[PDB]
Design an enzyme around this catalytic site. Structure first.
Site, PDB file in Angstrom:
ATOM      1  N   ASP A 190      29.031  38.245  29.654  1.00 27.45           N
ATOM      2  CA  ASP A 190      29.410  38.163  30.444  1.00 27.45           C
ATOM      3  C   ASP A 190      27.955  38.394  31.125  1.00 27.45           C
ATOM      4  OD1 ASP A 190      27.958  40.042  33.553  1.00 27.45           O
ATOM      5  OD2 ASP A 190      30.244  39.331  34.391  1.00 27.45           O
ATOM      6  N   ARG A 193      31.470  46.533  28.732  1.00 27.00           N
ATOM      7  CA  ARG A 193      31.563  46.287  29.548  1.00 27.00           C
ATOM      8  C   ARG A 193      31.211  44.306  29.909  1.00 27.00           C
ATOM      9  NH1 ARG A 193      28.460  49.003  32.165  1.00 27.00           N
ATOM     10  NH2 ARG A 193      27.122  47.804  33.022  1.00 27.00           N
ATOM     11  N   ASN A 194      30.632  44.165  28.934  1.00 28.15           N
ATOM     12  CA  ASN A 194      30.285  42.757  29.301  1.00 28.15           C
ATOM     13  C   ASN A 194      30.687  41.679  27.894  1.00 28.15           C
ATOM     14  OD1 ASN A 194      29.201  42.708  31.824  1.00 28.15           O
ATOM     15  ND2 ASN A 194      27.548  43.369  31.438  1.00 28.15           N
ATOM     16  N   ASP A 247      21.861  43.924  30.888  1.00 27.62           N
ATOM     17  CA  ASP A 247      22.973  44.417  31.239  1.00 27.62           C
ATOM     18  C   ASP A 247      23.802  44.023  30.049  1.00 27.62           C
ATOM     19  OD1 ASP A 247      24.338  46.000  32.108  1.00 27.62           O
ATOM     20  OD2 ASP A 247      25.656  45.085  33.774  1.00 27.62           O
TER      21      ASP A 247
HETATM   22  C1  LIG Z   1      43.083  38.072  26.985  1.00 27.22           C
HETATM   23  C2  LIG Z   1      41.949  37.924  27.496  1.00 27.22           C
HETATM   24  N1  LIG Z   1      41.677  38.761  28.597  1.00 27.22           N
HETATM   25  N2  LIG Z   1      42.303  40.863  29.143  1.00 27.22           N
HETATM   26  C3  LIG Z   1      41.471  41.080  29.318  1.00 27.22           C
HETATM   27 CL1  LIG Z   1      41.386  43.056  30.447  1.00 27.22          CL
HETATM   28  C4  LIG Z   1      40.371  40.244  29.611  1.00 27.22           C
HETATM   29  C5  LIG Z   1      40.146  39.528  28.730  1.00 27.22           C
HETATM   30  C6  LIG Z   1      39.336  38.344  28.578  1.00 27.22           C
HETATM   31  C7  LIG Z   1      39.115  37.587  27.630  1.00 27.22           C
HETATM   32  N3  LIG Z   1      38.306  36.479  27.424  1.00 27.22           N
HETATM   33  C8  LIG Z   1      37.159  36.176  27.991  1.00 27.22           C
HETATM   34  N4  LIG Z   1      36.895  34.648  28.186  1.00 27.22           N
HETATM   35  C9  LIG Z   1      37.238  36.884  29.503  1.00 27.22           C
HETATM   36  C10 LIG Z   1      37.917  37.690  29.368  1.00 27.22           C
HETATM   37  O1  LIG Z   1      36.223  36.556  30.617  1.00 27.22           O
HETATM   38  C11 LIG Z   1      36.272  37.298  31.636  1.00 27.22           C
HETATM   39  C12 LIG Z   1      35.118  36.245  32.270  1.00 27.22           C
HETATM   40  C13 LIG Z   1      35.690  38.712  30.951  1.00 27.22           C
HETATM   41  C14 LIG Z   1      34.619  38.691  30.439  1.00 27.22           C
HETATM   42  C15 LIG Z   1      33.917  40.002  29.650  1.00 27.22           C
HETATM   43  F1  LIG Z   1      32.084  39.885  29.062  1.00 27.22           F
HETATM   44  C16 LIG Z   1      34.457  41.216  30.165  1.00 27.22           C
HETATM   45  C17 LIG Z   1      35.227  41.022  30.581  1.00 27.22           C
HETATM   46  C18 LIG Z   1      36.187  39.726  31.542  1.00 27.22           C
HETATM   47  C19 LIG Z   1      37.313  40.362  31.533  1.00 27.22           C
HETATM   48  N5  LIG Z   1      37.808  40.322  33.051  1.00 27.22           N
HETATM   49  N6  LIG Z   1      38.978  40.587  33.831  1.00 27.22           N
HETATM   50  C20 LIG Z   1      39.061  40.758  34.676  1.00 27.22           C
HETATM   51  C21 LIG Z   1      39.184  40.676  32.193  1.00 27.22           C
HETATM   52  C22 LIG Z   1      38.572  40.459  31.395  1.00 27.22           C
HETATM   53  C23 LIG Z   1      39.263  41.154  30.072  1.00 27.22           C
END
Ligand SMILES: CCn1nc(Cl)c2c1-c1cnc(N)c(c1)O[C@H](C)c1cc(F)ccc1-c1nn(C)cc1C2
Length: 304
Positions: A179, A162-163, A158
């Protein structure tokens, strides 16, 4: 941890076995949650600190969850912990011995690539916020992560904006694969949740996954990058895309996309996996584009 304990799944990456035993258990008293970042499909994500304390993203497992949800969470922990590459998000550790269970990840201050592109789009408010070179650097960074996975025989399944995550919004940003939920689901063993818009014909027809699966998905990611965060196959449903792609249809170039960049997308989308480039060739083609003045001097569209 009876469900995780009793089953104790093996995880095999680069022909090395790891188990729950090998995860870095961080004492729960050393972990503080700062703010909610929203939620994914399942579980919340928080900004937190571990201890000049380490800044982390905390992925939580809901306390109300199935046996399958517990093993899924364990598998995700083992997958991310075993990678060592500059373009794959680091795992700081886990807290699986307290509830709710936690996975601790590198805090990526630039947030997800899809949100970054939509919000850093050139505008009259910020004319030169982003240029063709910034996009080629994001594409190179993710291709480098994809090459690491390919040479370690790991199929992501994937590769999508988004990941992906960014270390910071400004210059010096590094893009990373963030992700691994799709890879986790298959390792564990409906169609309306499959990322069909990122999948080559042999994947959605035959369930055949190889590193040439990721090549195809990377072509779609390149389109997402050079479109500045549009949804692929604008105005098509999943079934419309399936029929379009399986009949030889491909996306048009993004607005103002240079020919050499579009050509990398069209090579990534060859019908036969053997005709698609490996990530070494994709990286070489991205590097050539970054050299070419006619590519990097191309103006991105300004959103009104
Ligand atoms: C500055 C913090 N922030 N803000 C936003 Cl919006 C996001 C993040 C963030 C920063 N770092 C990390 N590792 C992180 C999030 O991990 C998660 C598991 C993740 C991983 C991913 F590949 C893609 C999206 C997300 C995510 N999920 N959600 C609910 C939001 C975010 C983005």
């Amino acid at each position: 941890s009876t469900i995780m304990t009793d089953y104790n799944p093996n995880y095999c990456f680069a022909g090395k076995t790891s188990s729950i035993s090998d995860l870095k258990e961080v004492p729960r008293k050393n972990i503080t949650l700062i703010r909610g970042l929203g939620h994914g499909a399942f579980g919340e994500v928080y900004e937190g600190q571990v201890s000049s304390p380490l800044q982390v993203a905390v992925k939580t497992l809901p306390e109300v969850c199935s046996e399958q949800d517990e093993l899924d969470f364990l598998m995700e922990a083992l997958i991310i912990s075993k990678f060592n590459h500059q373009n794959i998000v680091r795992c700081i550790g886990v807290s699986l011995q307290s509830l709710p269970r936690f996975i601790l990840m590198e805090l990526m201050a630039g947030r997800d690539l899809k949100s970054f592109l939509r919000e850093t789009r050139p505008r009259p408010s910020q004319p030169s916020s982003l240029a063709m070179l910034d996009l080629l650097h994001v594409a190179r960074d993710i291709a480098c992560g994809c090459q690491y996975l390919e040479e370690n025989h790991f199929i992501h399944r994937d590769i999508a904006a988004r990941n992906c995550l960014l270390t910071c919004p400004g210059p010096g940003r590094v893009a990373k694969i963030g992700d691994f939920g799709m890879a986790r689901d298959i390792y564990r063993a409906g169609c309306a949740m499959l990322p069909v818009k990122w999948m080559p014909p042999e994947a959605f027809m035959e369930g055949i996954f190889t590193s040439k699966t990721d090549t195809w998905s990377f072509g779609v990611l390149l389109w997402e990058i050079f479109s500045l965060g549009y949804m692929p196959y604008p105005s098509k449903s999943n079934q419309e895309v399936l029929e379009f792609v399986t009949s030889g249809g491909r996306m048009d170039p993004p607005k103002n996309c240079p020919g050499p960049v579009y050509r990398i997308m069209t090579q990534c989308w060859q019908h036969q996996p053997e005709d698609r480039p490996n990530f070494a060739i994709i990286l070489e083609r991205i590097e050539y584009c970054t050299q070419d003045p006619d590519v990097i001097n191309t103006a991105l569209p300004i959103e009104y």
